[PDB]
Amino acid sequence: SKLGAVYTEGGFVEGVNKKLGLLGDSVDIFKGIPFAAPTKALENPQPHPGWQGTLKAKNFKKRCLQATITQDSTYGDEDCLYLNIWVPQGRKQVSRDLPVMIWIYGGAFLMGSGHGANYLYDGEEIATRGNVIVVTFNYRVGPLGFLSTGDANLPGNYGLRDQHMAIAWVKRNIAAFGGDPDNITLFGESAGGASVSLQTLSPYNKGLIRRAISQSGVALSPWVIQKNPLFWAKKVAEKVGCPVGDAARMAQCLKVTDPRALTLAYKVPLAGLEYPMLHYVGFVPVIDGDFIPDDPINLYANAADIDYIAGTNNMDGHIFASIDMPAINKGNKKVTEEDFYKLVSEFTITKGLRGAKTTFDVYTESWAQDPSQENKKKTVVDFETDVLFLVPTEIALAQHRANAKSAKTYAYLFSHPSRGADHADDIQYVFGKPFATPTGYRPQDRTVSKAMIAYWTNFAKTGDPNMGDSAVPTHWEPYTTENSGYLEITKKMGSSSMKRSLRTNFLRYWTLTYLALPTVT
Numbered sequence: 427s428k429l430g431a432v433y434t435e436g437g438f439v440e441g442v443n444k445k446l447g448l449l450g451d452s453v454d455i456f457k458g459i460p461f462a463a464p465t466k467a468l469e470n471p472q473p474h475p476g477w478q479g480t481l482k483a484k485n486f487k488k489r490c491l492q493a494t495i496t497q498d499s500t501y502g503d504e505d506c507l508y509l510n511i512w513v514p515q516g517r518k519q520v521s522r523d524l525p526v527m528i529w530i531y532g533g534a535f536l537m538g539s540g541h542g543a544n545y546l547y548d549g550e551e552i553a554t555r556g557n558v559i560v561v562t563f564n565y566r567v568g569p570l571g572f573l574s575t576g577d578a579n580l581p582g583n584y585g586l587r588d589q590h591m592a593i594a595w596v597k598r599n600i601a602a603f604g605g606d607p608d609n610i611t612l613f614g615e616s617a618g619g620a621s622v623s624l625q626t627l628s629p630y631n632k633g634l635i636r637r638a639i640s641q642s643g644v645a646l647s648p649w650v651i652q653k654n655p656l657f658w659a660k661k662v663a664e665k666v667g668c669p670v671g672d673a674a675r676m677a678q679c680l681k682v683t684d685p686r687a688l689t690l691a692y693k694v695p696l697a698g699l700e701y702p703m704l705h706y707v708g709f710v711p712v713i714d715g716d717f718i719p720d721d722p723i724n725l726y727a728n729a730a731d732i733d734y735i736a737g738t739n740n741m742d743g744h745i746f747a748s749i750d751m752p753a754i755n756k757g758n759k760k761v762t763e764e765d766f767y768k769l770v771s772e773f774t775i776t777k778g779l780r781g782a783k784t785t786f787d788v789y790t791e792s793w794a795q796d797p798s799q800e801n802k803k804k805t806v807v808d809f810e811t812d813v814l815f816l817v818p819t820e821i822a823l824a825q826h827r828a829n830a831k832s833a834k835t836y837a838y839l840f841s842h843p844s845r846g847a848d849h850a851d852d853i854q855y856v857f858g859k860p861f862a863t864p865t866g867y868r869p870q871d872r873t874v875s876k877a878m879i880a881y882w883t884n885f886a887k888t889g890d891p892n893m894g895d896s897a898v899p900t901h902w903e904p905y906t907t908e909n910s911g912y913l914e915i916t917k918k919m920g921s922s923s924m925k926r927s928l929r930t931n932f933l934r935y936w937t938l939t940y941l942a943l944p945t946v947t
């Protein structure tokens with residue numbers, strides 16, 4: 427009931443065994459297995475050679491080169507394509523045919539690490555409580571992951587190819603660790619959720635992926651696909667002195683520039699912003715005609731046989747509303763009708779004055795009755811949540827359902843607070859932190875964490891969140907066009923926790939009324 431040295435495609439790998447409880451359960455922990463060669467700036471990833479003797483996989487390796495919080499310096503390294511594995515172990519014998527869950531972290535495609543914020547992405551609690559293998563890994567972010575010219579000179583999507591190389595590695599190697607290679611589940615959040623979604627839609631992953639979970643992000647969110655990459659490539663070239671005149675000479679120059687200078691070329695200011703934060707998403711995935719062959723809305727046939735959960739947090743837009751409208755935090759300042767109109771008008775520019783007005787009117791319908799500052803502030807949060815997360819997620823749900831063959835579809839809404847649910851509130855419960863650091867959490871927090879892991883890992887095992895090694899508080903009904911049901915996740919769950927048609931008039935507003943209006947110029 428211990429793996430010892432594991433024979434992988436590159437050679438033997440040695441991790442660490444950690445006993446759990448008194449009876450003799452344990453978990454095998456591997457950190458720092460390479461799945462791809464040290465990266466070359468703006469080039470596609472490539473195989474990692476192979477070692478002799480025994481690779482010791484004891485410590486996390488460096489994340490990929492990215493800007494620090496105060497974007498004055500960088501950390502990480504070009505040699506960052508590493509993954510980490512937790513394998514649970516019972517008392518009798520070594521595990522075999524385990525479901526395998528691969529975590530893709532988020533961070534607006536600008537930041538992140540396999541271990542993550544702090545470690546948050548310690549897979550031990552998912553693996554031991556759900557009885558699954560958890561894989562975490564690094565991929566390239568920022569300009570080094572996503573700089574692109576929009577054509578073959580610099581096709582972008584380097585960070586998405588790194589993700590694909592990790593998934594392919596797991597498929598061909600995870601059996602040696604006790605995993606079922608035909609039963610791989612991707613899950614991820616924010617930028618990671620969008621990436622999970624993009625991986626299911628890419629032809630590159632045919633046959634590799636069995637199921638997927640998108641938390642707070644899908645390939646259809648407006649901050650995912652860069653429609654004018656050449657513009658952002660030219661801002662970076664100017665900042666580092668590359669000649670802008672010609673695409674092919676611009677590409678060749680960019681590939682030779684100091685990767686630290688590429689990373690720090692552009693900075694997202696925090697203090698004073700002209701436009702909403704969405705206008706400043708720069709280095710993100712691109713429709714390249716290769717790894718992403720078309721607009722993601724046209725790719726869902728590739729997910730016909732991939733079971734899919736997608737969901738959002740109650741108040742996912744809160745952090746972005748607070749930045750775009752700082753009067754959301756400080757109760758000293760009123761949120762005014764004039765500020766919301768300005769916000770909304772900046773989100774609806776291609777539909778002009780009439781699209782701003784229709785949107786302002788629907789979202790402020792309820793302001794006549796009790797025009798209090800809490801209802802107004804809630805309205806700004808709901809607007810950002812709708813446009814950035816909820817509406818794209820429901821379009822993805824419907825599109826996945828319409829194209830499904832054998833695939834099941836499921837929707838959730840996470841609403842449990844701890845200070846509803848702000849952005850990335852769900853991660854710590856999904857990863858079992860209320861159990862791994864119990865003093866920092868309340869007993870009700872351990873109640874939500876247990877239920878999410880149970881659903882998530884039941885789904886990993888069978889494609890059905892209700893059926894697996896764990897009991898669940900309430901029956902999660904698959905999503906159909908007819909029932910349009912979602913599970914609402916909270917402290918107290920019973921049969922009423924299955925609801926339907928979340929904020930449906932708004933979904934109808936965005937998908938029928940708003941797009942029916944003429945584009946202007």
Ligand SMILES: [Zn+2]
Nearest residue numbers: 460463464474
């Ligand atoms: Zn190496």
Ligand SMILES: [Zn+2]
Nearest residue numbers: 487488489539
């Ligand atoms: Zn690190």
Ligand SMILES: [Zn+2]
Nearest residue numbers: 502503504505
């Ligand atoms: Zn280096």
Ligand SMILES: [Zn+2]
Nearest residue numbers: 762763764765
């Ligand atoms: Zn007014």
Ligand SMILES: [Zn+2]
Nearest residue numbers: 901902903904
């Ligand atoms: Zn049912």
